[PDB]
Amino acid sequence: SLQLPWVEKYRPQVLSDIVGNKETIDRLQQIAKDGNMPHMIISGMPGIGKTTSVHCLAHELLGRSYADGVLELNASDDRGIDVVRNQIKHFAQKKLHLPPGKHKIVILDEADSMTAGAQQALRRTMELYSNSTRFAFACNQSNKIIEPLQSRCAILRYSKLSDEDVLKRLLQIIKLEDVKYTNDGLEAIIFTAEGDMRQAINNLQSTVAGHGLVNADNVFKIVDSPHPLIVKKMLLASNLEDSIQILRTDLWKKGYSSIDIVTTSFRVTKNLAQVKESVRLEMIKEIGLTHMRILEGVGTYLQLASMLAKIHKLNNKA
Amino acid sequence: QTIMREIAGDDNSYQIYEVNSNMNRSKKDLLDILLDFTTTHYVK
Amino acid sequence: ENLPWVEKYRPETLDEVYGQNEVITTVRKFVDEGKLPHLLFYGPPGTGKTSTIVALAREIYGKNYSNMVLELNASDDRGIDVVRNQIKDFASTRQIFSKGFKLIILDEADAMTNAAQNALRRVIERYTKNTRFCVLANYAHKLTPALLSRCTRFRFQPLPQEAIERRIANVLVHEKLKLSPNAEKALIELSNGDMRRVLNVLQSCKATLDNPDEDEISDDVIYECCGAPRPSDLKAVLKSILEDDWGTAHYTLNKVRSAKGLALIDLIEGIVKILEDYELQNEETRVHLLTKLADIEYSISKGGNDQIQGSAVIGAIKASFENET
Amino acid sequence: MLEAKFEEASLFKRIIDGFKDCVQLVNFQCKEDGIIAQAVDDSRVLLVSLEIGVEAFQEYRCDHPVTLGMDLTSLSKILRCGNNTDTLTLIADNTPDSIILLFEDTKKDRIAEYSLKLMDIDADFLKIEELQYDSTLSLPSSEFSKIVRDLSQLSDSINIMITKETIKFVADGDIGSGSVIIKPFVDMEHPETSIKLEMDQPVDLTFGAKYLLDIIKGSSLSDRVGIRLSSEAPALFQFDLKSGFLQFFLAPKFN
Amino acid sequence: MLEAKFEEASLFKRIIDGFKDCVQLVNFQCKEDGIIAQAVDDSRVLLVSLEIGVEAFQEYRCDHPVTLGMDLTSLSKILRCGNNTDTLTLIADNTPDSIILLFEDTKKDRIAEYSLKLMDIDADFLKIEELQYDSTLSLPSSEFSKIVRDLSQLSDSINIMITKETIKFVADGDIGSGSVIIKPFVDMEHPETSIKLEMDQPVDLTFGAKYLLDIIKGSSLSDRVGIRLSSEAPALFQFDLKSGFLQFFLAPKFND
């Protein structure tokens, strides 16, 4: 059949389990405890726990009335002008008896995909029925929501999860799941996560399912991305012929497109520490020039070879 | 609304019919309603 | 019969999918175990993603495959509306079926828009219990992280020569064809991990033959059927730049480009590839050559006059390789 | 808790049908003596006041007063789900969010319960005070219904002229004019078809044709219609019921 | 190879009225023992099967099996022209290209002949697998039609629960809910309105409103409808006939 993914099997059902953004999570906990939930637009990068936060807040706020007091509208559901003018308005006008302070919650998840006219129609709906219902948006980009909607909500900008919180929750999951872990493997999981917590959990699950013990090499086998050590050796080699051979064999012939190679090189160089800050920024400038040339349309092998040549000049000389 | 409150002296006295964007502001949906509201007296 | 060799030599089972072996082994483990999560087969075109999913779908779903599998293509004239309509209608119907896990094969999902990808992620999340998706793409940098996190990514690498040559041997004996070793090597090095290109070039070479029974296919036949620079032409241009006069080098470059219909970008790339095989006494030679040729290629892409660009190529090569001497 | 049992399920259906077209949102305020309904028009012009007595129900408990705000479209839809022989039962809990309509039967075969979700409506108590209406005319409902039904096609505004104990319906247009005049009289053979008048002062008022056509949709609960017109007060079109009344409060136009 | 003669003409009109909304193309299979037909809609949710035996034929001659495709819209349009006095006669030649609809009276010489072009969709899939059902129940077609058109107004999904010695229909929607429970009884005046239920295992599964309205339009064919219910299996709604039956195979919905 199927096994429940650790992304879903270990999803926080309470607001306290959610790590990262401690101030916002604590204030949301206080709101859920007391009540009078304001209109909010929770925004940020993918995978930091926005939708989970909204659902946990709604659950804690309502309780047994969650089924008849929360209306969720994702992108799969229709959110046109007709939907806003009929379904949301009738839900707001619905008479549900809730404990004092609690209010009905209209969770409009992925509000950045909603049309502008629907957002305009939602403004009067939330302004009129705010004494019975409260709206909660969740968008990846906060600029796609119109200013009239943003002037009636408390914008929440969730930040990228730091290495400490991801490491803490990963240690929790590894401890309740009896997973053999190594420091290098966990560090690789954090590095490949890049703040995407869902990615970290998925990578841990894949590594455990495939290669058992979580070593760094095992983690770098299920990421289908250029190996950071291979890219670092390519960039930091003192012989240009070796760097060219590495780029030709381990990256170009293996099917890694120019965008992935440039992204991995940029990430490695940004994480590099033995070189000076000025050298770091100049190599980053060369990588940016190569990425620009790729975006224009010139993403051939010769551009990456010239990038390696410039980085070699910068490292060996100066 | 505040001007209405000051003019009438009471919240219940003034009757402001707000035509917001959350409804269909088309001729065949609101012309008769608005004409009847602005033509006769409110029941009070 | 009168069909292209692409469809005729399709892998009808998972045992005929050569080259990609990790993906096939993982997929066979998936079907034997019964755990079939949402799949994302991505990589260079012609690697065998559609072949893999079609073979697996047939192997699992026997005869009911026609009704239990819906094969989509987002590039068609549907858009987010009709695409979503079809997916929800296929996933929520729960038709009279022998078992379950209706499979939806969405081809060309890198052309799907951001809102469409988020909607597809939501639909995948809602109907996971009865419908399994195997979204297909060619580039992973055109897919949103929302869709990337709801599917088990399986990168496809360009097929290794050991495989391409095995399929060469398989097709050749069945179609009664003869490939000379130089011609076979040229085709293998020209496909660049593209089995579809191999089949198309082979069929064109069959049609080219005056007597397609016992006439061996030569190297020149493939290099002119595919439309690629011959190694001899690029080598002649390179040696003319390296050891001849400026006027003779210009004459050779212009003559080769005009006679073979070769653009300057292909000439630069082939010259770089050939010079990679050769060793240089100095390193500044390689650095300057690579940098100058990349700049020339970038300027060629934007536009200009081709005579000055060709002269710049010749001068850059000459200066770089006089640095080593 | 509310437990109101109708003798016939068609009674409440007819009562709802009497005003289901003019108004959409209605407050069903319920108290010990019975059910009192009050819905104002969406144009804020005409007010529908309905009162149902205790003697209209086979059983009626109403332990504590409760307000049942309901949408008339969905309520009419759920009401149309039954037969005349059914015994409709109105069931509502304490502080209800939904109203239960239990459709029983004389013999217990199809006991079908239907639930209707309530709506949040601002209740506005607008009972009239002691008013001395200058005119009080009562005629059979079928008569008035026929006159306005055939005479609203001539003009959008209807004038019911009353002077010297004479009823006259006026609606003037460019294509033509339509006037129907009936005099008060008492008939012993059928007193229900008689015309009565208790006029005090002359009044000549004009109201909309569409709203009178909406009013006469209530000409299915009573044989007669009670009209009380005042020169400086809204009109009162009352349909006397066996236990209460369905009175329409038509408002005058701007002078 | 068909000499189909019907004693009554309007019965076939109700037969095609039952077919009308569910599907638009049926390839009829005429055999020596009668006429059979099976089709599935485009969404693969509703399967319609028709069985007509020789008992509903004044005279029948179908010595060789014939595949008959015929548009039901055109047949309905032309069959609306059939009077209550005329009788239907279906005649098909060898490898038919146009089916002939014939009407003959008894007291007056009035002949009505019509021609209908066939289809060649090349689809004759006939699959039947379920021969057992956990719950078998029968009720008047008018009653079931009343219940479904009663509950389709509130929601697009109607549940048919079979709890111990009771039948329960549940439909929960946006404007409210609705629960119509009925208990079996034996009307001693006539079994035409009696409700009969066979109970082996509890049954709980939901269907679609539009599909159910598609089945219940076959209530013109017969005054009684037989409902066969079983978990994780296609439901069956038959309309009994003198020579055969018209039953519908319907796909339930997944709730999770």
Ligand SMILES: Nc1ncnc2c1ncn2[C@@H]1O[C@H](COP(=O)(O)OP(=O)(O)OP(O)(O)=S)[C@@H](O)[C@H]1O
């Ligand atoms: N801070 C966190 N603590 C614990 N689990 C987390 C945290 N952030 C994410 N997760 C987990 O990772 C997944 C994130 O799910 P969502 O919150 O729905 O993602 P998202 O933040 O809404 O971003 P999207 O879906 O790309 S718009 C869930 O399975 C969570 O259990």
Ligand SMILES: Nc1ncnc2c1ncn2[C@@H]1O[C@H](COP(=O)(O)OP(=O)(O)OP(O)(O)=S)[C@@H](O)[C@H]1O
């Ligand atoms: N690994 C393989 N083993 C055998 N045949 C292959 C393999 N990869 C590709 N082919 C053949 O090459 C062609 C590729 O067909 P497809 O799999 O449909 O293309 P694709 O790999 O899905 O990439 P596209 O361009 O996005 S459709 C077919 O004729 C296959 O028979």
Ligand SMILES: [Mg+2]
């Ligand atoms: Mg989300």
Ligand SMILES: [Mg+2]
């Ligand atoms: Mg394909």
